Ligand binder design. Sequence first.
Ligand SMILES: NC(=O)c1ccc[n+]([C@@H]2O[C@H](COP(=O)([O-])OP(=O)(O)OC[C@H]3O[C@@H](n4cnc5c(N)ncnc54)[C@H](OP(=O)(O)O)[C@@H]3O)[C@@H](O)[C@H]2O)c1
Ligand SMILES: NC(=O)c1ccc[n+]([C@@H]2O[C@H](COP(=O)([O-])OP(=O)(O)OC[C@H]3O[C@@H](n4cnc5c(N)ncnc54)[C@H](OP(=O)(O)O)[C@@H]3O)[C@@H](O)[C@H]2O)c1
Ligand SMILES: NC(=O)c1ccc[n+]([C@@H]2O[C@H](COP(=O)([O-])OP(=O)(O)OC[C@H]3O[C@@H](n4cnc5c(N)ncnc54)[C@H](OP(=O)(O)O)[C@@H]3O)[C@@H](O)[C@H]2O)c1
Ligand SMILES: NC(=O)c1ccc[n+]([C@@H]2O[C@H](COP(=O)([O-])OP(=O)(O)OC[C@H]3O[C@@H](n4cnc5c(N)ncnc54)[C@H](OP(=O)(O)O)[C@@H]3O)[C@@H](O)[C@H]2O)c1
Ligand SMILES: N#Cc1cc(Br)ccc1Oc1ccc(Cl)cc1O
Ligand SMILES: N#Cc1cc(Br)ccc1Oc1ccc(Cl)cc1O
Ligand SMILES: N#Cc1cc(Br)ccc1Oc1ccc(Cl)cc1O
Ligand SMILES: N#Cc1cc(Br)ccc1Oc1ccc(Cl)cc1O
Ligand SMILES: N[C@@H](CCC(=O)O)C(=O)O
Ligand SMILES: N[C@@H](CCC(=O)O)C(=O)O
Ligand SMILES: N[C@@H](CCC(=O)O)C(=O)O
Lengths: 254, 254, 254, 254
Amino acid sequence: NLENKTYVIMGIANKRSIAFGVAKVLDQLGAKLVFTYRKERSRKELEKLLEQLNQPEAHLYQIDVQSDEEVINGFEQIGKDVGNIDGVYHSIAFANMEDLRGRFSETSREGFLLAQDISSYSLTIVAHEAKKLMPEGGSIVATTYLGGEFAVQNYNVMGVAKASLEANVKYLALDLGPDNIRVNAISAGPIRTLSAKGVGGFNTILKEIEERAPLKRNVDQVEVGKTAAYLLSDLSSGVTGENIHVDSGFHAIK
Amino acid sequence: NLENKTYVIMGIANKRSIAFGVAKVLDQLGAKLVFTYRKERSRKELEKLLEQLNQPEAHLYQIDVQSDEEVINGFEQIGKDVGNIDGVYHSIAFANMEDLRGRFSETSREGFLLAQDISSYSLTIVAHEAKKLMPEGGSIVATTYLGGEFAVQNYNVMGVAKASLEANVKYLALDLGPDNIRVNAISAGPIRTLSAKGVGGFNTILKEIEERAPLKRNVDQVEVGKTAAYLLSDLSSGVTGENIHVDSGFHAIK
Amino acid sequence: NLENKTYVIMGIANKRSIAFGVAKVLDQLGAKLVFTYRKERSRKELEKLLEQLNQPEAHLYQIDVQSDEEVINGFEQIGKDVGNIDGVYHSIAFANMEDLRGRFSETSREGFLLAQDISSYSLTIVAHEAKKLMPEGGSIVATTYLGGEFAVQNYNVMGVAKASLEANVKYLALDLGPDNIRVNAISAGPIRTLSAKGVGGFNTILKEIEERAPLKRNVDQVEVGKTAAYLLSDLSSGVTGENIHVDSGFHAIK
Amino acid sequence: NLENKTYVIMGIANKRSIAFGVAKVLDQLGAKLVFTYRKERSRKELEKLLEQLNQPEAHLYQIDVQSDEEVINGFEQIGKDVGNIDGVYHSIAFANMEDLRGRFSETSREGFLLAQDISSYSLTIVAHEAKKLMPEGGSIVATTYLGGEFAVQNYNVMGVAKASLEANVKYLALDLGPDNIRVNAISAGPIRTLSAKGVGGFNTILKEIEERAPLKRNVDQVEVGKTAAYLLSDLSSGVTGENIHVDSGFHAIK
Ligand SMILES: NC(=O)c1ccc[n+]([C@@H]2O[C@H](COP(=O)([O-])OP(=O)(O)OC[C@H]3O[C@@H](n4cnc5c(N)ncnc54)[C@H](OP(=O)(O)O)[C@@H]3O)[C@@H](O)[C@H]2O)c1
Ligand SMILES: NC(=O)c1ccc[n+]([C@@H]2O[C@H](COP(=O)([O-])OP(=O)(O)OC[C@H]3O[C@@H](n4cnc5c(N)ncnc54)[C@H](OP(=O)(O)O)[C@@H]3O)[C@@H](O)[C@H]2O)c1
Ligand SMILES: NC(=O)c1ccc[n+]([C@@H]2O[C@H](COP(=O)([O-])OP(=O)(O)OC[C@H]3O[C@@H](n4cnc5c(N)ncnc54)[C@H](OP(=O)(O)O)[C@@H]3O)[C@@H](O)[C@H]2O)c1
Ligand SMILES: NC(=O)c1ccc[n+]([C@@H]2O[C@H](COP(=O)([O-])OP(=O)(O)OC[C@H]3O[C@@H](n4cnc5c(N)ncnc54)[C@H](OP(=O)(O)O)[C@@H]3O)[C@@H](O)[C@H]2O)c1
Ligand SMILES: N#Cc1cc(Br)ccc1Oc1ccc(Cl)cc1O
Ligand SMILES: N#Cc1cc(Br)ccc1Oc1ccc(Cl)cc1O
Ligand SMILES: N#Cc1cc(Br)ccc1Oc1ccc(Cl)cc1O
Ligand SMILES: N#Cc1cc(Br)ccc1Oc1ccc(Cl)cc1O
Ligand SMILES: N[C@@H](CCC(=O)O)C(=O)O
Ligand SMILES: N[C@@H](CCC(=O)O)C(=O)O
Ligand SMILES: N[C@@H](CCC(=O)O)C(=O)O
């Protein structure tokens, strides 16, 4: 039960975002929720989306994580508007589609550093900024994929940015541990989302989990958010630097 | 919230047992509990410990997991007394002191296999028998230690038995997954218990955690119980074949 | 270059044994070789496969690794016939078909313990006895498969025995380290051998390597031998407790 | 024996460089060696160090791996000068001490990307350009540290870059496999070099190896070279996407 908790959720794009999965779960559990979004263009659709929750007030902030200034100011404003927070769900990544298809050895320097910037480094800056709002400690969660642990076809530069994110999580957990801030990842199985259109052979991915994963089915955004609730609540009070696979068991098989 | 769930908790010896931390949590959340023990002396402790729980009824069964007969008849009697169950917590291990306190290369054959038998194989047969009382699906959790992933001083034959337990969890997840039975491990940090006395240098392991783990503190049995509640409940649907470290982040550092 | 080195090779049955590929490689490098066998039928293949080798002398010893006395007396006799040795290649496992070709959760106790006894514990007692023949250091290599680290279809009880075996290597590495005895594993890809017949769906494992592994081809026994040369030689002097995958990069993909 | 093979060795600054360890080993095995450097001062040191080697001529090229054109032109020029090569040893990393000597969560964006760029991405672009001199296949080896797998104190932004690098290796292995180009990492234990100076508490890392690693001693640059000879030669055919820890066992213990 998450009454009198406040969590910032970063990365809702539409009804299919894993982060709207997380949001519906935390909302039902009585958390006060704050949202960040990337582009002022899509604020309109995002307000409509959140009418579905039981949040009595919309707290929305434009933060594109390629800007220090936007993360610093955005979190500073959150603090003034809502006070101290209990945690952050990070659900954000990016690479150029044109890097993701064909040959990883052909990746450009710019495209490689972009995916690092948005998909890994953003966590670090967000943690430093969000720590200011968690004087008594709290919980940080980022979303990764099995590609950060193994070479998976077509995932290319994003795999290497996930490898990076996953270690980011570990170095943060160590750094912020003495402050009572826990930092974990959830490693989600494949789910149909906006950003999933940028991954070549997605249907073959989904298909294969159904065929081969221990549970013989794919997972969904609500299953991610239920593990997010665990990771963000006191239920997981002993757990940091961890990566939980919400992937129907697929990480465990070969 | 676990009203109308029933769980079987194997391996309480006293108030310090990790499994009694699990019981206190699940009892607090409303679950019906069933308990198994090997020694007479443990049944007597269990009768005393039950006065601190809300359990209106004392369901206790002697099960020495070295005996198929006892595991088989144990679980049969459970389904006869309480009906279908929702999961099993397995909190059982053993090894001879004289293997543990020698160099590993001197482990006796009968010692090595004794450790396998009680600490790993017991999970396999328990799962087979518990499966019969889980026609709708369910969840099974076993307790491991970090010495099954790495070589730790003084842990010797138990390390190799936990390496076996951890694979046993994964093979079980794969097998039972289509039956909607999830199988997971919790890798607990060092906790002072009766059996912790068989681990040479134990106080030193404790101090290392306080000094070096992200959270700079040790964990306790209620904290294992809280992760156990997540794994035995529907919050962790989609998670199987997983090993969740409740160890203050110590697994993530080196 | 292993001139004036002596190695003991355990587990040749015929021309397709991985251990025979080890032999061909260490023989080509000038090593003096000693072979151990279980069935008198394997001693007859060894006498025939010897003609193929440069070995001027046959050094052949019956050692069933289920018998302490056979391992003890075998290695003592090796010592008396050839003097101190430089290392041991262990290429030995077993499980019953009846356990292997069932659901893993249906595994028998005696079959589970048989598979641990021959496939894991055998290493620990061989290391202990072999150590008396390595008073100034040496190398011990055992053979494992990816099914030790992941739940692989059809591999069942042998997956748990390989998990055990891989921890055995780490614990042995840690114990025997200060004696300058290194202990490592080779994780071989699927190779068609006599024992391969005991893995269900083995043909479909071979073909999956060809299509999905980075090198897009299956390995052979000579490739395992070449990596065993490295591990068993001064080339790998600061390497210990390690698992080397000789599998065309299959371990690294999902 | 690497007679009539040619290897490009990137990252020698002085006698203590790990890459000079590679160089001595391969030069001793009869390989033709080409060397790349960044600072003119490193070139001068290469000219002196060459006197110790068997190399009958100096093949030195300036390649700052931050520069696409310097990588592209350096390798092209290498092909014209010596022809086709057999592989590359990459021994290059960098980060600012002002990001390294402060909390991880305080890392600057530009510092984070700097270390990714020099320490991880350089491998990708080196592979793409070096593939052009390997029509026949070959071997590429990069140098990493355990800090890429675990959160180690003081290593901070370099550990996230080594994590990126180890995933880079796996993805390069999958991408260049069908070209018969193998791609691997060596995980070296701590060695006194010039860059070691950038790691806070380096002396306390050295001594922990001695006290705790299985072999109870630190390793040196020649041991790295010895495993590099194995990865770069036909002995490790079958081996790709892998990370060999040349670290006296340390990775296997907790
Ligand atoms: N779907 C899967 O199968 C899967 C599996 C495992 C992990 N994940 C991970 O889960 C997370 C969410 O992905 P998703 O599938 O839910 O897709 P999604 O709905 O498209 O969400 C991705 C979000 O990232 C935001 N974003 C991208 N760049 C940003 C920037 N510079 N600043 C702020 N926000 C930015 C996007 O904003 P805009 O729409 O405004 O661009 C979008 O809201 C990602 O980390 C992804 O890598 C996904
Ligand atoms: N304490 C730690 O720091 C630590 C850390 C990580 C993991 N673990 C694991 O946590 C689990 C619980 O251990 P613990 O520390 O809580 O110690 P504990 O209180 O001593 O419990 C050990 C239990 O194992 C039972 N047991 C042993 N052999 C049995 C058999 N043949 N049949 C049925 N029960 C048997 C004992 O029952 P009887 O007394 O009646 O014989 C006892 O209840 C174990 O798997 C242990 O390896 C412990
Ligand atoms: N083939 C593969 O795809 C593959 C892949 C990965 C790992 N491996 C591993 O490689 C190793 C060798 O297997 P292989 O494929 O070469 O098969 P193999 O040629 O059939 O050899 C297996 C050997 O095990 C010996 N052995 C079994 N039980 C023994 C006992 N109780 N005492 C003494 N020796 C015993 C057998 O000897 P007898 O015939 O005299 O009884 C036989 O020589 C095994 O550890 C296996 O698990 C194989
Ligand atoms: N020493 C250790 O304990 C240790 C342990 C594990 C891994 N490693 C790794 O081993 C590799 C070599 O380090 P080391 O200890 O041998 O130190 P080193 O002797 O100081 O070598 C580092 C090399 O990196 C080069 N370099 C830095 N930035 C470059 C750039 N932009 N372009 C071209 N070259 C660049 C330097 O060249 P210039 O001087 O000419 O700039 C130098 O030759 C690194 O990847 C390091 O992470 C070291
Ligand atoms: N967010 C996001 C995202 C961006 C790109 Br471009 C590619 C994939 C993205 O999310 C995923 C979707 C699907 C999978 Cl399987 C993994 C992901 O990381
Ligand atoms: N149960 C149990 C158990 C039995 C022996 Br003998 C040795 C250790 C046991 O439990 C643990 C206690 C402490 C630690 Cl750190 C790990 C454990 O596995
Ligand atoms: N030795 C041996 C062995 C015995 C049985 Br029963 C089953 C498999 C055995 O070796 C393998 C054959 C094939 C593979 Cl893929 C892995 C192995 O461990
Ligand atoms: N090359 C390099 C390098 C540069 C910086 Br700045 C920091 C460390 C570097 O090398 C290492 C030295 C020592 C260790 Cl233990 C690890 C390393 O990766
Ligand atoms: N440290 C003592 C006491 C045992 C324990 O720590 O549990 C020993 O080495 O046996
Ligand atoms: N797949 C067949 C053939 C056995 C084998 O592949 O070795 C089976 O289950 O027996
Ligand atoms: N430990 C000192 C010296 C650095 C080193 O060990 O290289 C520091 O933190 O800077």
